[PDB]
Amino acid sequence: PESADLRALAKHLYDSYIKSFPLTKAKARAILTGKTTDKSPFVIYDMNSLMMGEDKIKFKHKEVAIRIFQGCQFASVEAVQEITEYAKSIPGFVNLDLNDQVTLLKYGVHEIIYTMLASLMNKDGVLISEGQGFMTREFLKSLRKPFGDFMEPKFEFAVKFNALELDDSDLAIFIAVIILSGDRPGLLNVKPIEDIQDNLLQALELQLKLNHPESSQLFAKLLQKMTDLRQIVTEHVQLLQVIKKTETDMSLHPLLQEIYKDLY
Amino acid sequence: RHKILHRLLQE
Ligand SMILES: Cc1ccc(NC(=O)c2ccc(CN3CCN(C)CC3)cc2)cc1Nc1nccc(-c2cccnc2)n1
């Protein structure tokens, strides 16, 4: 039936997800429990460990808070490219209006970054540089303001979100559902977007049944978190309004500028 | 406006 077309969708999306993103939640969780036979991540808990850790972290090439925040930017910019490549794999996404493609990504990417960033997070800290590093939550709190407050809400959201014990195959459709948001400010031709999202939501529903109990209630939980996201995305962009003025010295990445342009 | 986004999409 059409219940077969939905498993095809979920499996096509999952394959795009594996290929588009370097590190799956599967591996990320393995690393975070030491359970992996792979080498341990260099643990960063203070400036000393950061300065010793420059070795095992994808380099950049002057203040530690600003240097750490500068690390997030390059990671975010790589994520936007991985997310943009994945969106292109969502059946009918590239057939949409190229202005609507830009709009869906503009608003979608930070919500998906935070969804996927939870995969790398526990209460104690965050896997960075594709699992080669582990930056502690306490250390990130210890940064001078406004940089101290930069990643706490992401930690807060991740501990709630990780509750739902979703898998990669759940996350592939979920993030596809987040991109295909009909209600994004500035969208020209909504109904084609809203059509696709209905398809993805059916596939998400089916996927969640075949993998979890209290499915409608999980599926329900998972669609309210989808607004917990827009919250922390709004909160995040205000903190960057703060940082753009209060820290005139440090510059923002041109791609991160294209996105935050007229955002909330 | 949105030059790099356009580039990455049409890429
Ligand atoms: C401090 C921090 C917080 C978060 C992140 N990472 C991200 O923001 C991020 C978000 C989403 C993804 C997407 N990813 C794909 C899918 N997998 C399952 C989940 C997530 C990847 C990274 C990096 C960092 N820090 C970081 N990362 C790399 C390098 C450096 C760094 C630090 C100091 C000097 N030079 C470099 N610092």
A14: which residues sit within 8 A by CB, 6+ positions away? A168, A169, A172
Q: Whose CA is nearest to atom 3 of ligand 1?
A: A72
Two tokens at A233?
Answer: 């995305």
Interface test with B, best of A78, A84, A90, A95 (most B CBs within 10 A): A84
Instruction: Give A200's DSSP letter.
Output: H
How many alpha carbons lie under 13 Å from residue A37 in its C-beta half-sphere?
0
Three state DSSP letters for A1-48 = CHHHHHHHHHHHHHHHHHHHCCCCHHHHHHHHCCCCCCCCCEEECCHH
Distances A40 to A29, A46, A208, B9 between C-alpha atoms, Å:
12, 18, 32, 36
Which experimental technique did the depositors report for determining this structure? X-ray
Q: Which CATH superfamily is domain A1-264 in?
A: Retinoid X Receptor (1.10.565.10)
Q: Which residues pair with A128 in a beta bridge?
A: A133
- Partners of residue A261 in chain B, C-beta under 8 Å: 1-2
The rounded distance, in Å, linking the Cα atoms of A124 and A9 is 36
- Residues of chain B in Cβ contact (below 8 Å) with chain A: 1-6, 8-10
Regarding the beta carbon of A127 and ligand 1, being less than 6 Å apart is answered: no
Tell me which residue in B3, B4, B9 faces A101 most closely, judged by beta carbons.
B9
Regarding the beta carbon of A47 and ligand 1, being less than 6 Å apart is answered: no
Q: What is the DSSP string of A109-172?
A: HHHHHHHHHHHTB-SSEEEETTTTEEEEHHHHHTSPTTGGGSSHHHHHHHHHHHHT---HHHHH
Distance A185 CA to ligand 1 centre (A): 28
Question: Which of A58, A73, A92 lies closest to A196 in space, CA to CA?
Answer: A92
Interface test with A, best of B1, B2, B7, B11 (most A CBs within 10 A): B2
Q: Which residues does a chain break follow in chain A (C to N more than 2.5 Å)?
A: 61
Distances A28 to A24, A128, A225, B8 between C-alpha atoms, Å:
6, 10, 21, 27
Residue of A nearest to B4 (CA): A255
Q: How many residues does chain B have?
A: 11
User: Is-contact A177 A226, C-beta < 8 A?
Assistant: yes
Ligand 1 site-directed mutation target among A128, A137, A233, most atoms within 8 Å of CB: A128
Distances A113 to A84, A175, A205 between C-alpha atoms, Å:
12, 9, 22
Distance of CA A207 to the CA centre of its chain: 20
The rounded distance, in Å, linking the Cα atoms of A75 and A185 is 26
Two tokens at A3?
Answer: 């219940």
Angle at A117 between CA A53 and CA A150, to 5 degrees: 70
Q: Whose CA is nearest to atom 26 of ligand 1?
A: A71
Nearest atom in ligand 1 to A151's CA: 3
The rounded distance, in Å, linking the Cα atoms of A167 and A14 is 10
Residue A165 gets the label, from left (phi > 0), alpha (psi -120 to 50) or beta, of left
